[PDB]
Amino acid sequence: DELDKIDLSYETTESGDTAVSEDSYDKYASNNTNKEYVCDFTDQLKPTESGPKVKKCEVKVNEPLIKVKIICPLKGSVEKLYDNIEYVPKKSPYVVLTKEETKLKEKLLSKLIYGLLISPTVNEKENNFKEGVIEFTLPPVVHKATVFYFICDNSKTEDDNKKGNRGIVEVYVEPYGNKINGCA
């Protein structure tokens, strides 16, 4: 199903076509409100002057049973400020972008982290960037550190002299917990 259709290498960089390097990345974490890492890309990917400036959301997880939510505006959300937006990877509540060599490649987050609580329904809607909001819940114990990325690119969005930015999500997970008190 759409959960797992990994057959494309899709070699790409973090900055993509933008020439901005990691020294000038606008690195600010997802908001923390009642155990919810949210970094909504609303109004942060619109065409604007002095760009494209790469915007990176860093989610550092060190607690069990963590909920992570990411929002990207859809096409036509506001008049002529979100056209030609692209979402990478196309299946990104489950398939995630990982780093081998010096490239970003798609992989299944279930394989990287066991016990991922994928919610197929979020707010009675589908869980994908096709809705614009992605939702999943992390397990309470993680054996080893895992890093994966999500991409919300607005470089192709322009309005005369204005151009859109590029949105990146970096989720950084450290080991925590020992075991679950229960059955298997």
Epitope: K27, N31, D40, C57
Partner: antibody, heavy 124, light 109 residues
Framework: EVQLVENGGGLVKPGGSLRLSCAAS????????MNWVRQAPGKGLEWVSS????????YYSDSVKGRFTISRDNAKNSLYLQMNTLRAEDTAVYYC?????????????????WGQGTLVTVSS | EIVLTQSPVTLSLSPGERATLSCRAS??????LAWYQQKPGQAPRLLIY???NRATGIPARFSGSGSGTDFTLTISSLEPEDFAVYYC??????????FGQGTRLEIKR
């Protein structure tokens, strides 16, 4: 209740460095963001720099990109900005404002408490 | 970067009138506007955070409005102590955090 006091100013050498410090009393600076804003005489307010997650993330304005450095110490509960080499056309009074954790939202009671401000007079 | 314009520059109204201040977002701000009150001899004071929510301890006569753009700050009855300078700020496209130019209120004697 809550007070924010800044120190450092007076006569400033045009073509030299200077360090300003901010001290917070009556409140423990943790899990919150801090910002620097300046206001030149006869001109409106302008953002300078801000810091997040204690010292993990730091942000600067385009005019002060690289030339200014921001730092925060949790043990001393103080906010420091450093004008590294020299800047002379930034003559203004600098304010500090408590704010929520910086992020891709920035919503909340930004600037709930403000510092009285220090006049940075970079002139001969 | 998005530039915020506050218009008109100077307002002359008599005490007791309902004062309306107009703020225009150049492109758009996703309900991230804030209102501040300042005087020459003191630091600025937060009146309205978010689009229309009132801050803690602010008198009830201060009220905000707006939906993503064209945010107006409406004071139901302008008291003589309310004559001050007011600024606007947006927190949707940052850095930088762009402030407003400011507007003056004077007593129309």
């Amino acid at each position: 209740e809550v007070q924010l006091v800044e120190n450092g100013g007076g006569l400033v050498k045009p073509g030299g460095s200077l360090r300003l410090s901010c001290a917070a009393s009556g409140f423990t600076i943790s899990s919150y963001g801090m910002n620097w804003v300046r206001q030149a005489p006869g001109k409106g307010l302008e953002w300078v720099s801000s810091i997040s997650s204690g010292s993990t993330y730091k942000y600067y304005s385009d005019s002060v990109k690289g030339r200014f450095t921001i730092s925060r110490d949790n043990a001393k509960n103080s906010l420091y900005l450093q004008m590294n080499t020299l800047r002379a056309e930034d003559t203004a009074v600098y304010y500090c404002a408590r704010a929520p954790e910086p992020g891709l939202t920035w919503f909340g009671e930004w600037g709930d408490y403000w510092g009285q401000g220090t006049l940075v007079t970079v002139s001969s | 970067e998005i530039v915020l314009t506050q218009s008109p520059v100077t307002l002359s109204l008599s005490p007791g009138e309902r004062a309306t201040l107009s703020c225009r977002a150049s492109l758009s701000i996703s309900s991230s506007l804030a209102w501040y009150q300042q005087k020459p001899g003191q630091a600025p004071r937060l009146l309205i955070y978010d689009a229309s929510n009132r801050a803690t301890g602010i008198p009830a006569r201060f009220s905000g409005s707006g939906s993503g753009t064209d945010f107006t700050l409406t004071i139901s009855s302008l008291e003589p102590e309310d004559f001050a300078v007011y600024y606007c700020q947006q927190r949707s496209i940052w850095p930088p955090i762009t402030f407003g130019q400011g507007t003056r209120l004077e007593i129309k004697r």
